[PDB]
Design a protein around this nucleic acid. Structure first.
Lengths: 100, 135, 56, 47, 93, 78
RNA sequence: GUGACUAUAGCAAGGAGGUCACACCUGUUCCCAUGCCGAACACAGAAGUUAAGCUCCUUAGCGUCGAUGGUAGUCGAACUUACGUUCCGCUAGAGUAGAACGUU
RNA sequence: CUGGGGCGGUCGCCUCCUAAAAGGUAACGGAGGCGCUCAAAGGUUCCCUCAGAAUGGUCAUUCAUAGAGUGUAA
RNA sequence: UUAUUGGAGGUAGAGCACUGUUUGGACUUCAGACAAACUCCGAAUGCCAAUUAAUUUAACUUGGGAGUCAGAACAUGGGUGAUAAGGUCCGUGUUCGAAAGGGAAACAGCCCAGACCACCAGCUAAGGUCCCAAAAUAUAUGUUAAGUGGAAAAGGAUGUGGCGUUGUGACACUGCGCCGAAAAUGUACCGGGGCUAAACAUAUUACCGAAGCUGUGGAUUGUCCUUUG
């Protein structure tokens, strides 16, 4: 799937992009806000730090960004579908204070 | 006599006759051959005459390869007409031969029968030639 | 100011860019002679028109 | 074959947005949602 | 077999090569382990009567560094309209 | 023996319109093309009709996109 | 994970490496799902397995990179009709590299 | 218009070639088309990947950088 | 204009990786070819810039007044024609047009060279140096016997020289010659006489040769102010 999840992500990322990029797994979710003109990361969030934990990771990434002084973002669904887990990952950062 | 079976374009600009030969300069299919030493257009009708001479001389014993093929159709206009009013009708098919190309190759024959056959061929082709043997 | 360059052939019947080069060297008439400090870029002008000049 | 139709705001203001339709494949009085700029609003158009 | 070849040095202009070819010399190039691309000249007949002796895929001692290195003949160009070899490739080992 | 040929079309002035290293304005056309022989880089708009134009005022630069595809970007001067 | 680079970055082959991650695998309860099928997308997951996917290594068969030297081709002269000098400099083919580097 | 004129052909627009690697470039030079068509064949968000060669009895599998398709010529 | 750099682009060439044409083998495949409308490739040049350095004299805008819209030859890249035409139609440069002077015998377009005027001055360019006709019967070395030089092919051939490989003969390049070579007023395809060097090829020496350049005088415009000269 990742050999084709990556293809849908490269399809996504032709118009879009700082990034708030994601990565699902069988049990974990790897969120991270990344610059896209230096390759630099700005914040961090993982699952080992299925929707309760999606809200957990969303809150974590949002409060880390709040410590890091950045508000307005662009959300990359990374080629996954915007639904359920990634749905909640988007609706946690808005509810933690952020711009989508 | 010889001609391609399909051509995409009946009418073509005529090939460059000035320069040297780019490919087919070394005996490949056989032992002996006739190398060209002068540029011209060889028509299918005279390619065939040279082949007939070479074939009948060897008793139809040895093997021959006609290394050149006429791909290019030259046109001509009718008897007594003025210039213009379109390009003419296909007269025949020609190959362009430049200094160094190997017109015919033979094998299955000693040097002397092959030499006389190739000599008797070179008199029906509008170019000068010489006798060549594989390296 | 090395490179004493003299115009020794005419420019009648020479291409026009060549006529431009020799005038940009400052050679007015035939047998005229300009002194010009040897550059790496003034030398490239006396190769466009090597046949019509004499250098020394 | 194609008619050269003329749309006309249902409510207010009329006869803008010329287009063309296909009569045999649309033998009906077509309808659109266009910007009636007279009354500065999205509104229906006919004909 | 034994061959002596002296280096050609400088930029080989057009006239220079056309002088070496209307004299009886064949330009050559050498390379392989330890050779390091000495552009050389060889006798246009001596090479014939050495390679026709040692055969096509033989072994040849040349004037490489004024010493022998057991060279090969990778490729060779051949102006056929005069039957004259035009360039040789000596692949060392 | 008349002929059924001869007619052609008006040639449409097509291709590069600025130079690699040149200062361009905010809406200048950088290249004209059918299809995409050169894709739009950064701050380059790939307008309709497939023409490539600049957006900001800057210096133009033809780069490549890996192998077999090249792009045009525009930069800020100084 | 995630970016940058012209595959010297790929293919193809042999070889090991496990639930710590990544996987496949349990199933349709749940949100959602096929113009039929939880095959897919997605949801609830603990078994079980290193076979496959896959990270890591060997390989120069296939692709890709590719000199030095020579040749063709011409820019400009200069004789005359195809050469001669100057100068740039091909493709092809071999010497070769090469099983990638790499930012956060 | 016209390799005298008449007869024949043509006349506006598009895509190639000639055209000489910027653009431009003629002939009664070599090839084709146009005088429309879509209310979804437009917009937008998502999802997917073709042609063909074989193994079988529309299907399935594999091989496959594109040889498909792109309303309509190139 | 040139040097340095960056660039776009698909011509020459080349190649068969795609579309087509094709030759010989073996049962898709190995070798070999072809292309204006074929491209895995790909120049030299030309073009665009830097707001990139050294020389040089333009560039542009605004206005007044125009003529031009029958072009030609040669060199090179092509189409058409028949790789005919002093043909025709395009790109590229030059000369004529609107250009006199020297050479090509004479000869708008070929080569040299751009006339302000005068001189019974000098140096040279193309081209030349036995006489017509100014200047070498020059110097060194070789070739050619046909008057080749001073017109023409396939093809032929113990012409003659050079170098080369061969076991006295044979061949591979080769330079120069021979035959093929018949037309209409009068030799009549060196301008003529004549030429065996006064031909050819190569290599240093001289000299001749223009209205070019220089020398001397003069006439006009200009621009620096050496220094209103």
């Amino acid at each position: 799937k990742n050999k084709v999840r990556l293809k849908r992500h490269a399809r996504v990322r032709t118009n879009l992009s700082p990034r708030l990029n994601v990565y699902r797994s069988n049990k974990h979710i790897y969120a991270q806000i990344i610059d896209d003109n230096k390759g630099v990361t700005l914040a961090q969030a993982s699952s080992k730090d299925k929707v309760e934990l999606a809200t957990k990771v969303g809150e974590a990434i949002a409060k880390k960004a709040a410590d890091k002084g950045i508000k307005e973002i662009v959300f990359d669904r990374g080629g996954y579908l915007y639904h359920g887990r990634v749905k909640a990952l988007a609706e946690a950062a808005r509810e933690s204070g952020l711009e989508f | 006599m010889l001609l391609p079976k399909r051509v995409k374009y009946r009418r073509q600009h005529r090939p460059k006759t000035t320069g040297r030969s780019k490919g087919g300069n070394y005996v490949t299919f056989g032992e002996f051959g006739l190398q060209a030493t002068t540029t011209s257009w060889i028509t299918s009708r005279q390619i065939e005459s040279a082949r007939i001479a070479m074939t009948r001389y060897m008793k139809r014993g040895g093997k021959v390869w006609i290394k050149i093929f006429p791909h290019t159709p030259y046109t001509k206009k009718p008897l007594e007409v003025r210039m213009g009013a379109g390009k003419g009708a296909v007269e025949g098919w020609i190959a362009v031969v430049k200094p160094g190309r190997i017109l015919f190759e033979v094998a299955g024959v000693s040097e002397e029968v092959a030499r006389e056959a190739l000599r008797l061929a070179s008199h029906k082709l509008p170019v000068k030639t010489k006798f060549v043997k594989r390296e | 100011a090395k490179l004493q360059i003299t115009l020794t052939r005419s420019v009648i019947g020479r291409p026009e860019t060549q006529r431009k080069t020799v005038e940009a060297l400052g050679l007015k008439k035939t047998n005229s002679s300009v002194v010009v400090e040897d550059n790496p870029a003034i030398r490239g002008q006396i190769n466009k028109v090597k046949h019509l000049v004499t250098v020394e | 074959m194609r008619v050269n139709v003329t749309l006309a705001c249902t409510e207010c203001g009329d006869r803008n947005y010329i287009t063309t339709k296909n009569k045999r494949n649309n033998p009906e009085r077509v309808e659109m949602k266009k910007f009636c700029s007279r009354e500065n609003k999205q509104t229906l158009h006919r004909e | 077999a034994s061959l002596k070849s002296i280096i050609r040095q400088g930029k080989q202009t057009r006239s220079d090569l056309k002088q070496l070819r209307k004299s009886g010399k064949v330009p050559a190039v050498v390379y392989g382990y330890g050779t390091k691309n000495v552009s050389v000249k060889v006798d246009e007949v001596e090479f014939i009567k050495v390679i026709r002796e040692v055969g096509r895929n033989g072994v040849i001692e040349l004037g490489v560094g004024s010493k022998t290195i057991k060279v090969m003949v990778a490729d060779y160009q051949f102006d056929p309209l005069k039957n004259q070899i035009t360039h040789i490739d000596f692949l060392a080992i | 023996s008349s002929t059924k040929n001869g007619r052609d079309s008006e040639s449409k002035r097509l291709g590069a319109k600025r130079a690699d290293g040149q200062f361009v304005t905010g809406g200048s056309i950088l290249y004209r093309q059918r299809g995409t022989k050169i894709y739009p880089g950064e701050n380059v708009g790939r307008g309709g009709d497939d023409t490539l134009f600049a957006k900001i005022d800057g210096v133009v630069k033809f780069e490549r996109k890996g192998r077999d595809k090249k792009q045009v970007s525009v930069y800020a001067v100084a």
